[PDB]
Amino acid sequence: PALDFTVENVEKALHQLYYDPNIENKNLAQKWLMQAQVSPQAWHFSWQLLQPDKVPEIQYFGASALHIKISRYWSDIPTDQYESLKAQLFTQITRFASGSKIVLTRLCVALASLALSMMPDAWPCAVADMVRLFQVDGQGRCLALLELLTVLPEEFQTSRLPQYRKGLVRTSLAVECGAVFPLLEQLLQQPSSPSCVRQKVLKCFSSWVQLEVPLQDCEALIQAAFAALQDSELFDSSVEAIVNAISQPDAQRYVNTLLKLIPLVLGLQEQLRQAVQNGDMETSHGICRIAVALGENHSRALLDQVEHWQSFLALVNMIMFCTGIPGHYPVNETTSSLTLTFWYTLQDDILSFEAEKQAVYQQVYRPVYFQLVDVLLHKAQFPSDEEYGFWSSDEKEQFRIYRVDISDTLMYVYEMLGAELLSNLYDKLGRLLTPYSWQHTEALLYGFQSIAETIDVNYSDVVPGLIGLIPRISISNVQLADTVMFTIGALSEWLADHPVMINSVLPLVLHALGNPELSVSSVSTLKKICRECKYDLPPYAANIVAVSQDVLMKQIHKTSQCMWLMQALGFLLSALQVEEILKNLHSLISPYIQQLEKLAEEIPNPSNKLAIVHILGLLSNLFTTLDISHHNPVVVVLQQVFQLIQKVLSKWLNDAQVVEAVCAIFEKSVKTLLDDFAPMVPQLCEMLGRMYSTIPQASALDLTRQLVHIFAHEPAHFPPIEALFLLVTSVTLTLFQQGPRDHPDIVDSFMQLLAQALKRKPDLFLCERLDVKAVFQCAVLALKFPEAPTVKASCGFFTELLPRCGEVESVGKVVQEDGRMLLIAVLEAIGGQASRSLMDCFADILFALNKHCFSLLSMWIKEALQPPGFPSARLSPEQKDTFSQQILREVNKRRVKEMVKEFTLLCR
Amino acid sequence: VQFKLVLVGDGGTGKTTFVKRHLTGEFEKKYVATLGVEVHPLVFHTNRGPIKFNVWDTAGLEKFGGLRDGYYIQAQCAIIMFDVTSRVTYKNVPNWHRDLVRVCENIPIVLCGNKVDIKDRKVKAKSIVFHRKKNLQYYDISAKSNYNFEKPFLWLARKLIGDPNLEFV
Amino acid sequence: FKEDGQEYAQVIKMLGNGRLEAMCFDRLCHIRGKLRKKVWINTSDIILVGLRDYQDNKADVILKYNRSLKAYGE
Ligand SMILES: Nc1nc2c(ncn2[C@@H]2O[C@H](COP(=O)(O)OP(=O)(O)OP(=O)(O)O)[C@@H](O)[C@H]2O)c(=O)[nH]1
Ligand SMILES: [Mg+2]
């Protein structure tokens, strides 16, 4: 059974793919169509699909097929058919003037692709030829022409070509731009042109300025586009054209036209003023996009040209006006957000100038920025509760993110204004605290929160008084309280240096740990406190653990929130004296162990699962941040834990999540204590070794790697870890036989382990159990993997192993015995079997081969290159020799990457 | 309710793993280049009722691209995906948007940044400016840690049905 | 080692307030907050900045160099 690639069959297949509900039917139809598109018969049937007899859904495939035949497979198209292929397209495009827009666009894309594929010399004047060819409808002909001319430059931005060809095309295209522009200018200038056309003109112009085109040439179309802004149907087109022509990178050099642009943008002000009043969001939004597009893209130059300081100021004001548009951003006005970027740039530019002139400009724009603070704090101010509750969830989130962006801009504003701003904020807040709406207080406090973290201690006079004000603030409303907590959390680093103030803020935060509505803030703040102010915290600690116990006893916090509290308590205990710390930790973990005992004895239940996970996680988090080493009783607790852990593991081995959670405790506890992790090593190796024999898990490999890197040098705890390593190697390699690509995580992690081991203790490779040949086989196979990070890790291992040769006889013999295959695999990878991103990770290996074993690499490369077209068929016989001669020399490491890049670029 | 969603974006992004994560609830560690289009129906429960999104999973690699734009026809909406750890994917975004608009102009599209869960991030969160349109919104999704899993489909469902109040069951 | 969107630079001038003017071997450089306070940069010192996508003129000081780069040949 078979279906020849004819129009009827292709059409039936299209109808099936587009309408048949069966998945496999679509998957079959689509494949048969994959064949149909590439098939030669396509050249005949495509046109027949474009006939008026068929639905647009069918016609479009006909157009797309052509587009793909030309774009993907241009090399196959014979030279004699060229003209025949061109002309045809044109004619069809003409027919689709009144036809479906989608198909017309696809055909124009196709013709553009053909043009670019024969742009350099074969089609000398494509633009002028299109113009002449188009000049039965007349208006639709112009529209089609404009669509083509619009698609032409963008299809170049995505056309994949070699550097020389790409440049050679870009030049000839730049030549054509100057022929396209007048056609656009004339069509716009003439009053006999309809809006439908003018839009296509603006879009065409905008599509052309996406390429690096001299602004001085664009000027006329800029003027016309500014004129078109008064028209309602042309606004969205003209604004995009204007912005795309102004915001372009090359426009920075042309200051002469950029100065002539300024008075035009200031002209839009009355249309902006009316739009803000009339509630026309689209218009004010567009006009603001224009204003900012000028501002942020030409600020430094506009300031440098001091002779027009008056204009720029006005511009700034306009932008300021767009910042202070009455109402809130999410709903009332879409404008304000767009403004933010500009402000930063201006600040930057003003700080970029030499100090002498910088003072001159700062004297002008400092009050502008002080006004910017008043504006931004008022807009970020929450609306009334009655109104806010009515906002769309999307709108609330929009305002949240928006508020984050403002919080970000205030951070730089502080870098500009300095302590004076802090003084103003403190004075305002004090004035407010000393009807009454929390929104204002929370606004100022939000500004203070945004700024506080970046504030230096050198000029921090406001901070003490601020901390003085914090308790005076009402905890009535939740948002204000959250802002308070976050503000404290930001003040943490300052609170560490001045522990006398801690007593005034601590109870305010500990109270918030009780309320469930503040969970995210409070805890975080507490963590941020405990992590920063640890040495001075122990006198207050008795109440902290007590309140932590009560707040945890009640189900006030979600689990993920509790975890942070466990980390916090870890940081807290890290400072306290040993005995008291052990007693307190025992007290806090005592209810947790009892619940763990209760879950283990019970048969594995779905309700019990999450309950066990919670305890395991709380333990892990408690262990992550508790470190008396300040780079241990935690080991004492770990020993007692080990039995219950073993029972729980015996009961819940099959559950992957629970197992991972159980391993996590050891992972964190090991990462925390470097040298103090030794007295638990013998017990840990037996637990992990049995766990890895049952089911392979990458986390276990990583843990073994950590144990290796930490405890290698200390021999006293080395013997048990050695057995776990060798066991792991035997289990992986045997698992790898069943499925190579089946478990990339395990492979990647294993490569990490072997690399760490090769670096830390090369002698370990001498042991007999490990199949040093099979390992090398697995790593050699790893470079072929489609998973990128696994390949990268294998490359890392390779990079580590090479200098170890000679120093270790196992590595030397292994490399001598199986060395050629590795270079074969690397050359295969460079040839085109690997992505271009990991190339630099591959090259490293090669470089190492030069640094460790020149004599072997010379012969290996020499032999590997001999067969014709080994890495790639495109490679010439002389190029193999140039790569050989280059790579041979005993050469810097960085140049090898460049050589490799050029080679792989040539191959692909 | 039936709505066709075309899932596009650069190759190796992890969109197939997202779809698989939603269909089976299992994250797949291994990466296989998707050939052509992978059509899978995903159904989400809502207070209005059940909404069905027919996901056409597009090839990202150029060589496996296949029919390409031909999948886009009749799509009510789209999801563009990029890898946070790789800048090139983000650089290619306007290209995917451009091809999508040509076939379907005003359809709601969601931009998704993935592998955010990964410690090292190549793309800062500040850079994203795609959501500046009314029919566009950005999300940080993590197919592994399941962070913001339903968010794109939720936003799309709301914008399509016409009910901003619509929530997931 | 340098990454994409990042150039290795050497300090040319000082602007203060966490800002420096420098000339990459391949612009204005900006050093941020606590990291900038912790490490003092000087003129003609080796550095490494990350290019900003919006403006090629401005970059962010990412790493302070203490010799290996000369051996690398970057
Ligand atoms: N860390 C992390 N990795 C992810 C995540 N999502 C996907 N990945 C990675 O992406 C890989 C899967 O690739 P695929 O989903 O097959 O990529 P694709 O969507 O098929 O791309 P195409 O073939 O072009 O269609 C996995 O091996 C993961 O390592 C994530 O959320 N976090
Ligand atoms: Mg896929």
Coordinates of C-alpha atoms in Angstrom, one line a residue, chain B residues 45-166:
Chain B
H45 CA -10.2 21.2 35.4
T46 CA -11.8 24.6 36.1
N47 CA -14.8 26.0 37.9
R48 CA -16.5 26.7 34.6
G49 CA -15.8 23.1 33.6
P50 CA -13.1 21.1 31.9
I51 CA -10.9 22.9 29.3
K52 CA -9.0 20.9 26.7
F53 CA -5.8 22.2 25.1
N54 CA -4.5 20.3 22.1
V55 CA -0.7 20.8 22.3
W56 CA 1.3 20.6 19.0
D57 CA 4.9 20.1 20.2
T58 CA 7.2 21.6 17.6
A59 CA 10.7 20.6 16.7
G60 CA 13.3 23.2 17.8
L61 CA 16.3 21.9 15.8
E62 CA 16.4 23.2 12.2
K63 CA 17.2 19.7 10.7
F64 CA 14.3 18.1 12.5
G65 CA 12.0 21.1 11.9
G66 CA 10.0 19.3 9.2
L67 CA 6.8 20.9 8.1
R68 CA 7.6 23.8 10.4
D69 CA 5.1 26.7 10.0
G70 CA 2.5 24.2 8.7
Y71 CA 1.8 23.1 12.2
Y72 CA 0.9 26.7 13.2
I73 CA -2.3 26.9 11.1
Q74 CA -5.5 27.2 13.1
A75 CA -3.7 27.6 16.4
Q76 CA -5.8 29.6 18.9
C77 CA -2.7 30.3 20.9
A78 CA 1.0 29.5 21.5
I79 CA 3.8 29.0 24.0
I80 CA 7.3 30.0 23.2
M81 CA 10.1 28.4 25.3
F82 CA 13.7 29.3 26.0
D83 CA 16.5 28.0 28.3
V84 CA 17.5 30.4 31.1
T85 CA 21.0 28.9 31.2
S86 CA 21.6 29.5 27.5
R87 CA 21.5 33.0 26.0
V88 CA 21.2 31.9 22.3
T89 CA 17.7 30.5 23.0
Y90 CA 16.6 33.9 24.2
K91 CA 18.3 35.6 21.3
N92 CA 16.2 33.5 18.9
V93 CA 12.9 34.4 20.6
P94 CA 11.8 37.3 18.2
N95 CA 12.3 34.9 15.3
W96 CA 9.8 32.4 16.8
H97 CA 7.4 35.2 17.5
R98 CA 7.8 36.5 13.9
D99 CA 6.9 33.1 12.3
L100 CA 4.0 32.6 14.7
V101 CA 2.4 36.0 13.9
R102 CA 2.7 35.5 10.1
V103 CA 0.4 32.4 10.3
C104 CA -1.7 33.7 13.2
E105 CA -1.6 37.4 14.1
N106 CA -3.4 38.2 17.3
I107 CA -3.3 34.9 19.1
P108 CA -2.3 35.0 22.8
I109 CA 1.3 33.8 23.3
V110 CA 3.1 33.0 26.5
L111 CA 6.9 33.4 26.9
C112 CA 8.5 30.8 29.2
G113 CA 11.9 30.7 30.7
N114 CA 13.1 27.3 31.9
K115 CA 15.9 25.6 33.9
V116 CA 15.4 28.5 36.4
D117 CA 15.7 25.9 39.2
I118 CA 19.4 25.5 38.0
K119 CA 21.7 27.5 40.2
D120 CA 23.7 29.3 37.5
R121 CA 21.4 31.5 35.4
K122 CA 22.7 33.1 32.2
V123 CA 19.6 35.3 31.7
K124 CA 18.7 37.9 34.3
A125 CA 15.0 38.3 35.1
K126 CA 15.2 42.0 34.3
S127 CA 15.8 41.5 30.6
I128 CA 12.4 40.1 29.6
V129 CA 10.5 42.8 27.7
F130 CA 8.2 40.6 25.7
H131 CA 5.2 40.9 28.1
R132 CA 4.8 44.5 27.2
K133 CA 1.9 43.6 25.0
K134 CA -1.7 43.0 26.1
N135 CA -1.7 39.6 24.5
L136 CA 1.6 38.6 25.9
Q137 CA 2.8 37.6 29.4
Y138 CA 6.0 36.1 30.7
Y139 CA 6.6 33.2 33.2
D140 CA 9.5 31.5 34.8
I141 CA 8.7 27.8 34.6
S142 CA 10.8 24.9 35.9
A143 CA 9.8 21.5 34.4
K144 CA 11.8 19.8 37.1
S145 CA 10.8 21.6 40.3
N146 CA 7.4 22.1 38.9
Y147 CA 7.6 25.9 39.6
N148 CA 4.8 27.8 37.8
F149 CA 3.6 24.6 36.0
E150 CA 0.0 25.6 35.4
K151 CA 0.6 29.4 35.1
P152 CA 1.0 29.6 31.3
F153 CA -2.0 27.3 30.7
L154 CA -4.0 29.2 33.3
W155 CA -3.3 32.6 31.8
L156 CA -4.1 31.3 28.3
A157 CA -7.3 29.7 29.5
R158 CA -8.4 33.0 31.1
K159 CA -7.5 35.1 28.1
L160 CA -9.3 32.6 25.8
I161 CA -12.5 32.0 27.7
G162 CA -12.7 35.7 28.5
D163 CA -13.0 35.2 32.2
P164 CA -10.2 36.7 34.3
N165 CA -11.9 35.2 37.3
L166 CA -11.4 31.6 36.1

